[PDB]
């Protein structure tokens, strides 16, 4: 029944959106070029500050549009009719027994009614050593209609009829198949779902589900018929596993809350979390065949939903606890994969910007064009010849992060967001080279970091050389040296306070 949707006047809105994007890009290019003519190395604080206020205004706009959406969703009330079925589809590939059993218990203890909740688990097994997942699934429920199948091959080379009847007729289904990656199991589950249900939730084998999460997703999805997909707030089950774990948790909270609420205010959520997401079965079936043959991401499914003409939402009342990598360069590989998926799709959504609000185009344009401008500004400032320039660049970056953390603290109401300032160091060393390598691609991850470190150290050395070339005995350098020393001691004290409060909040 559902089909692709277009606005009332596709040509007018398309032209308006492309004109707006082109004008925004040209305006940004004008100011940076205007900045080079208007000011040189003479006024770095003016050169940087203007940009800092730009980011700050963007952050305030996002925060306002997120707070408005949060207040609207909190004030609005709608009792659940409990007349819509929900099918929870879970993927398995050699999962740890404890995490899997926790996920199964969480899925079996949802507040949703038993008669309206189907459960399907698809495993990349087909071997004897994967039978423990099926055994655990059988022992966990043991009470409802349990149907387990082993199979001898995936859907793309009879077991197909058995799988379909077991999924569509029983409540708890456990289907194993030949290993084909996380896309094969999701495709098999979606194909076997058919028309049995109308709402399908996607989950992985390592998440813990809250009791009211499914109820809240059903409530928000039943409010309007134009919604096609919805997500929830995903927390971290191990915030103190490592240093990167707490930073990942803080970044997850900030990203989810601010960005997803701001996008839900315009119904243009770009990405829906894989562990916590719900989709319409009628819409999902239409794009299912197309999605499998694309040359199984959560950003790709959301992009397909957006391209189908329907809008996606996000509610903070639905909560779940996922996990994040704790060993180094693994978070880096995950970030590189995320950047590739983001870029291969920044390319997808560049086609149907007119189908949603102009906020989608604005955010895409700024996210595509800012990192390059930041990199160019950093390179220009470091490759100047004065320690003043690089020192004040670092100071201004840390100041920007400090106001960002303060704003996050004010928004959340908790003072733990002040610790997010280390994200600046995290991004300035690992995230930019990873993004560049991901762009160029379309151990391995250690090369971009080494290249970035080498170029940064070369720039610092060149600046130091050019600074010591001039004699400092002249009376025009004493004030510069005093200012540099005061700035350096302030930076050292700020970093010491940051680390001290980090250790106090972590150890206790």
């Amino acid at each position, epitope marked *: 029944i559902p089909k692709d949707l277009e606005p009332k006047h596709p040509t007018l809105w398309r032209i308006i959106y492309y004109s707006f994007g082109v004008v925004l890009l040209a305006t940004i290019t004008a100011a940076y070029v205007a900045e080079f003519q208007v000011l040189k190395h003479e006024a770095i604080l003016f050169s940087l500050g203007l940009y800092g206020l730009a980011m700050l205004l963007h952050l305030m706009m996002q925060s306002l549009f997120a707070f408005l959406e949060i207040r609207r969703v909190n004030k609005s009330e709608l009792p659940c009719s409990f007349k819509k079925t929900v099918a929870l589809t879970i993927a398995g590939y050699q999962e740890n027994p404890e995490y899997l059993i926790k996920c199964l218990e969480s899925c079996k203890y949802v507040k949703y009614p038993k*008669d309206k909740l189907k459960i399907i688990l698809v495993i990349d097994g087909n071997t004897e050593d994967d039978a423990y997942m099926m055994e655990m699934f059988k022992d966990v429920f043991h009470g409802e*209609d349990v149907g387990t199948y082993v199979w001898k091959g995936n859907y793309h080379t009879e077991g197909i009829n058995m799988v379909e009847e077991l999924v569509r*007729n029983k*409540r708890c289904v456990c289907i194993m198949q030949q290993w084909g990656g996380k896309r094969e199991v999701m495709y098999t589950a979606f194909q076997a779902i058919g028309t*049995s249900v109308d709402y399908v939730q996607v989950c992985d084998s390592d998440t813990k589900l809250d009791e009211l999460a499914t109820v809240e997703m059903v409530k928000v999805l039943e409010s309007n018929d134009m919604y096609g997909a919805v997500g929830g707030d995903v927390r971290i089950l191990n915030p103190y596993d490592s240093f990167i774990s707490f930073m990942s948790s803080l970044r997850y909270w900030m990203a989810f809350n601010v960005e997803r609420a701001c996008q839900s205010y315009f119904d243009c959520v770009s990405c829906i979390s894989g562990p916590l997401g719900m989709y319409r079965n009628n819409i999902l079936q239409v794009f299912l065949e197309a999605w499998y043959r694309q040359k199984g991401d959560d950003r790709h499914l959301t992009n397909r939903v957006l391209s189908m003409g329907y809008r996606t939402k996000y509610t903070h009342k639905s909560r779940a606890f996922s996990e994040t990598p704790s060993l180094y360069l693994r978070w880096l590989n995950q970030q590189t994969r995320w950047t590739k998926s983001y870029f291969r799709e920044w390319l997808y959504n560049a086609q149907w910007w007119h189908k949603h609000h102009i906020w989608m185009t604005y955010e895409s344009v700024v996210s595509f064009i800012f990192p390059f401008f930041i990199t160019a500004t950093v390179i220009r400032l470091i490759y100047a010849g004065t320690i003043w320039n690089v020192v004040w660049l670092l100071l201004c970056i840390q100041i920007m992060s400090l106001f960002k953390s303060i704003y996050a603290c004010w928004l959340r109401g908790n003072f733990i967001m002040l610790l997010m300032s280390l994200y600046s160091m995290l991004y300035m060393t690992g995230l930019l080279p990873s993004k560049y390598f991901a762009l160029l691609t379309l151990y391995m991850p250690i090369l971009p970091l080494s290249i970035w470190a080498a170029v940064l150290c070369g720039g610092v050395g060149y600046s130091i050389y050019m600074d010591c070339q001039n004699d400092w005995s002249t009376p025009e350098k004493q004030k510069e040296m005093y200012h540099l020393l005061y700035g350096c001691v302030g930076y050292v004290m700020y970093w010491v306070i940051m680390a001290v409060m980090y250790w106090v909040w972590v150890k206790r």
Partner: antibody, heavy 124, light 106 residues
Framework: SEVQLVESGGGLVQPGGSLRLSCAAS????????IHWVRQAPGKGLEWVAS????????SYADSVKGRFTISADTSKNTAYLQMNSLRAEDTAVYYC????????????????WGQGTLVTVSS | IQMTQSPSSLSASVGDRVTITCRAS??????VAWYQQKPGKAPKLLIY???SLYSGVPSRFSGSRSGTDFTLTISSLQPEDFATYYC?????????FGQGTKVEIK
């Protein structure tokens, strides 16, 4: 394997009286399965009376059954009860308690594991 | 809201393919099941969800649908096949049963 349903409470009652049939299940829990009551009049086909899904509160009754019959389930005793009051002449039949799965979409699963009925005689 | 089992009677010899057809007024979101009942015993389920076959049933009962009509076919009339066949449309808050369709012998 061992799933069974045994119902009792049938008997001879005066017209306009009350009755309480009870079907107890063995080998499974009634909380994860639907329970339905089917009545077969002598010399006629099966007729549906009521259906209940415990742990959810979803109860349904027929058009000619509504207003006089009540259906309930008790998980502690694992027994489904059907109470009838103000019975009429056209109520003497054999009542079956049968289990089934969930409805979902267009796939149900049918009425599996039926039980041998009991005779009800509403006459004077 | 009502159903009609068209044959309502049948009399065929052994090894003869028989077909029982059932017409339902509405089949939007409801499943059709075919049961078999012998005199003095409770009905036994044969084919679920229109075409799916129940476990233990011999591979001679075929269920099919053609829109508003549902057909149950027996390729060969085995000696343990003469009973009453019932067609039921199962749905929430409304369950209807068929009538008649007794297969005799000749």
């Amino acid at each position: 394997s061992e799933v069974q349903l045994v119902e009792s409470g049938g008997g001879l009652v005066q017209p306009g009286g009350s009755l309480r049939l009870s079907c107890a299940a063995s080998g499974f829990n009634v909380s994860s399965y639907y329970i339905h009551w089917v009545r077969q009049a002598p010399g006629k086909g099966l007729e549906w009376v009521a259906s209940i899904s415990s742990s959810s509160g979803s109860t349904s009754y027929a058009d000619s059954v509504k207003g006089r019959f009540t259906i309930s389930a008790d998980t502690s005793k694992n027994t489904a009860y059907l109470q009838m009051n103000s019975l009429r002449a056209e109520d003497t039949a054999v009542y079956y308690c049968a289990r089934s799965g969930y409805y979902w979409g267009p796939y149900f699963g049918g009425f599996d594991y039926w039980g041998q009925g009991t005779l009800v005689t509403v006459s004077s | 809201i009502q159903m009609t089992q068209s044959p309502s009677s049948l009399s065929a010899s052994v090894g003869d393919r028989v077909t029982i057809t059932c017409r339902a007024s509405q089949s939007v979101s409801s499943a059709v099941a075919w049961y078999q009942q012998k005199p003095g015993k409770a009905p036994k389920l044969l084919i679920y969800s229109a075409s799916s076959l129940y476990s233990g049933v011999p591979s001679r009962f075929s269920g099919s649908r053609s829109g508003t009509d549902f057909t149950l076919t027996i390729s060969s009339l085995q000696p343990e096949d003469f009973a009453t066949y019932y067609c039921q449309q199962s749905s929430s808050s409304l369950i209807t049963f068929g009538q008649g369709t007794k297969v005799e012998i000749k």
